Amino acid sequence: GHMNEIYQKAKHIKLFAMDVDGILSDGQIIYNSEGTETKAFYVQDGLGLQALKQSGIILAIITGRSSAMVDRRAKELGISHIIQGQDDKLTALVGLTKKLGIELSHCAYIGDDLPDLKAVREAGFGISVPNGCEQTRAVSDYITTKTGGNGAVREVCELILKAQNNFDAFIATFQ
Amino acid sequence: HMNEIYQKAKHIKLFAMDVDGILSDGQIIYNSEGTETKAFYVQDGLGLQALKQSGIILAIITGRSSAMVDRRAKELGISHIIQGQDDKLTALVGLTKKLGIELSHCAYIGDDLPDLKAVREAGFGISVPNGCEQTRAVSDYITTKTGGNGAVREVCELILKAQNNFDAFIATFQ
Amino acid sequence: HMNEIYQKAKHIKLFAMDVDGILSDGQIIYNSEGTETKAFYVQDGLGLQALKQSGIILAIITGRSSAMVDRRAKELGISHIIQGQDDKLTALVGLTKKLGIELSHCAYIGDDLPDLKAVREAGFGISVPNGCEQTRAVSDYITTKTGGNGAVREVCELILKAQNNFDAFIATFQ
Amino acid sequence: MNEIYQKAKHIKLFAMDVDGILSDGQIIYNSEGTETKAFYVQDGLGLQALKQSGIILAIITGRSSAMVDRRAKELGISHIIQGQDDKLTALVGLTKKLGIELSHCAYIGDDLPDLKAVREAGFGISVPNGCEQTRAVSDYITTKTGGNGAVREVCELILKAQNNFDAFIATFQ
Ligand SMILES: [Mg+2]
Ligand SMILES: [Mg+2]
Ligand SMILES: [Mg+2]
Ligand SMILES: [Mg+2]
């Protein structure tokens, strides 16, 4: 019943910012006996992000943790705004608005836990996921059907493209 | 039955946890270089931080021993790390005496048979959906979320709520 | 539509496959030492071996590039390993020309948009439950089992059955 | 139910496939050439319990890895036969050298290479995600899946059949 409300918020998005753990991954933090840390991403999310970028949308990562894995994933996907070691997601997002000349109302943010709440609440289009905390889900404009690390990002990428009448055009390039 | 669960959680000063099956989904991972791997859940970290910040002491009691457990514990401020110990009750009782906290003010979460007595005898005993039937049977509470998937975060929030500390935790992010 | 599916599968001489989301569940795994990991499914290995032994040529066509794919392919006797190639149809047509096999006698299994044209134009196009809707729409068959969980094994058995080789394959183990 | 218990009651040797039984069947490779395999904690306790009750534990697998050696060592799995082409002839060979009749052997497997061993063992076991043909010749199919408690489940079944289960539980009470 909220589809066109969601569409109106997504239609004006010029910047798409994302949390990592629980969004681009299923939230697993993986350590081994040699001190090495591991993180897993989802292939379909990659193509979804490529689609947004192709449509002219600026991509950003804002995470409280810091790893080479995030740097590597961001670089291969052409995400050039990689903010790590930053729990205060909203201040980081506002920082980007000033850096890039994009209004906050034209920014999307997807997050899963409490550090993401304010950014999800205050962004033009705030998104969460089924396994997100209840409080961040409560302030979201949209909650994905697919879970983090299992297509949540791909799903909201398609949603934004649809709201901007760019989805069918993108699909047609593969047909 | 949440009223009696909140009543038990109200008095908790020490929260002790098994590792495999609780903080992880129970996978023991090895590779051809001789390296062992373990996986944890990001939301459990924030939950344990909230518990610690509220004044509750955190402990790990595990039958295995690994560097991953030391790293994760250090990262989350788990100050009492007991590894290579299958006898969970003796370990928990040892902690009660050392810290000066009654067993009735201890919470313990476990998943398999070695955890049974500690879950049964602790002031607040918790298990998980994929815990063994016998350990689930003696639990005061079984989580909705599974081990390595938010069971720990869930218990953390329950204890915070019971102690009127949950909304203060949430408020910092609003 | 199974009579039509069997018709298409009956004449397959080349079986070509996407990797991520087909042979794996789609996870791209990195670690802090710059190492990449990929996971495959054991039962898929036997299925592909069976297809190969029945006289079908095996091929991989993937947009990514890794040593893990080379290793898995060599292990299973996948003889055409095309990596760093998102244009699946051009690669597949290239194979038809090199091997002297009509496109109508090629099978292709894929999960996402880059695979769409190949799935559509191949003699037998296959996708998977978690494949994108657009690639599923142009498929001749969609597996019950998921990518990295037996989707490949399933279609291998389907092709063996369509070519009257399945029961004979089973018989070798009895 | 009772026919299963009759077959399980006299088991002296419990032999197992690895991939799809002790694991969920994932074969994991990395860019440094390193292979990974995952096991389940609850299976560990189940196997240890079986071993302590006097049952000899064995692994018979077509693949070969250090991970299997490591997991076997920590659980007291004392016969580790890797890289085996024919699992039935490996089981027959092992049970002959140990002086145990095949009728007193259990074997759990998931795929076609396990079929003959599951069929011919005194107690043959498979798993839900096992192939239909191996499931067809099994005396018992577990409810839990490989790498997710299938082994723990059958261990408890055998303990029950040998009047050792309630005592096993009681040691933890
Ligand atoms: Mg997160
Ligand atoms: Mg445990
Ligand atoms: Mg793919
Ligand atoms: Mg197997």
Helix-then-strand count for chain A, H and E: 8, 8
Name every chain C residue with its beta carbon within 8 A of the beta carbon of D27: 39-42, 45, 72
Residue B106 buriedness (CB in 10 A; 0-12 / 13-18 / 19+):
buried
Name every chain B residue with its beta carbon within 8 A of the beta carbon of D39: 27-30
CA angle D160, D165, D169 (to 5 degrees): 155
Torsion sign across C-alpha atoms C32, C36, C42, C44: positive
CA angle C108, D26, C172 (to 5 degrees): 70
Inter-chain residue contact B170 with A31, CB threshold 8 Å: no
Q: Amino acid identity of B168?
A: A
Nearest partner of B93 among B77, B106, B75, B81, judged by Cα = B106
Nearest ligand to the C-alpha atom of residue A64: 1
- Helix/strand/coil percent split, chain B, to 5: 45, 20, 35
Q: CB-CB: which of C21, C33, C130 is closest to A36?
A: C33
The residues, ordered by sequence, that sit 6+ positions from D135 with a Cβ below 8 Å of its Cβ are: D126, D141
Spatial distance between the Cα atoms of B48 and B77, rounded to a whole number of angstroms: 8
- Give the neighbor-by-neighbor strand order of the sheet with B80-82: B80-82, B57-61, B14-17, B106-109, B124-127, B141-142
Beta carbons within 10 angstroms of residue A83's beta carbon: 18
Which residues have a beta carbon within 5 Å of ligand 4, which is an ion? D 17, 19-20, 110-111
**CATH architecture of the domain with range A1-175:** 3-Layer(aba) Sandwich (3.40)
Spatial distance between the Cα atoms of D62 and C42, rounded to a whole number of angstroms: 11
Chain breaks in chain D (C to N over 2.5 A) after: none
Give the Å distance between the CA of B40 and the centre of ligand 4. Answer: 27
Nearest CA in chain D to B33: D34
Hey, is D123 helix, strand or coil? strand
Helix-then-strand count for chain C, H and E: 8, 8
Spatial distance between the Cα atoms of B112 and B116, rounded to a whole number of angstroms: 7
**CATH architecture of the domain with range D1-173:** 3-Layer(aba) Sandwich (3.40)
DSSP class of A123:
S
**CA-derived radius of gyration, chain B:** 15
Hey, is C18 helix, strand or coil? coil
Spatial distance between the Cα atoms of A31 and A85, rounded to a whole number of angstroms: 18
Two structure tokens written together for C107: 């099978």
Beta carbons within 10 angstroms of residue D63's beta carbon: 17
Q: How far is A18 from chain C (nearest CA, A)?
A: 18
Spatial distance between the Cα atoms of C123 and C100, rounded to a whole number of angstroms: 15
Q: How far is B66 from chain A (nearest CA, A)?
A: 7
In which region does residue A28 sit, left (phi positive, over 0), alpha (psi from -120 to 50) or beta (all else)? Answer: beta
- Beta pairing partners, C38: D29
What residues does each domain of chain B span?
1-174
- Chain C interface test: which of A28, A44, A76, A171 (most C C-beta within 10 Å): A44
Q: Tally the residues of chain B.
A: 174
Inter-chain residue contact B174 with A118, CB threshold 8 Å: yes
Give the Å distance between the CA of D148 and the centre of ligand 3. Answer: 27
DSSP class of D55:
P
Q: Are D44 and D87 in contact (CB under 8 A)?
A: no
Q: Are A110 and A153 in contact (CB under 8 A)?
A: yes
| CATH assignment, C1-174 | 3.40.50.1000
Spatial distance between the Cα atoms of A108 and A148, rounded to a whole number of angstroms: 16
Report CA dihedral (D97, D98, D99, D105) to the nearest 10 degrees: -110
Where helices occur in chain B by DSSP H, the ranges are: 2-9, 42-53, 67-76, 88-99, 116-121, 133-137, 151-162, 166-171
- Long-range CB contacts (within 8 A, 24+) of A87-92: A87/A115, A88/A115, A89/A19, A89/A62, A89/A115, A89/A116, A89/A118, A89/A119, A90/A118, A90/A119, A90/A122, A92/A62, A92/A119
Nearest 5°: phi and psi at B57? Answer: -85, 140
Two structure tokens written together for C171: 């018989």
The DSSP code sequence of C79-112 is: -EEE-S---HHHHHHHHHHHHT--GGGEEEE--S
Report CA dihedral (C91, C95, C96, C97) to the nearest 10 degrees: 100
Name every chain C residue with its beta carbon within 8 A of the beta carbon of D112: 46, 170, 173
Nearest partner of B114 among B146, B77, B143, B82, judged by Cα = B82
Experimental method: X-ray
Q: Are C122 and C8 in contact (CB under 8 A)?
A: no
Q: Are C59 and C18 in contact (CB under 8 A)?
A: no
Listed resolution, Å: 1.6
Spatial distance between the Cα atoms of B32 and D36, rounded to a whole number of angstroms: 6
Hey, is B76 helix, strand or coil? helix
Name every chain B residue with its beta carbon within 8 A of the beta carbon of A31: 37-40, 67-68, 71-72
Nearest ligand to the C-alpha atom of residue D26: 4
Buried b (16+ CB within 10 A) or exposed e, C123-134: bbbbbbebbbeb
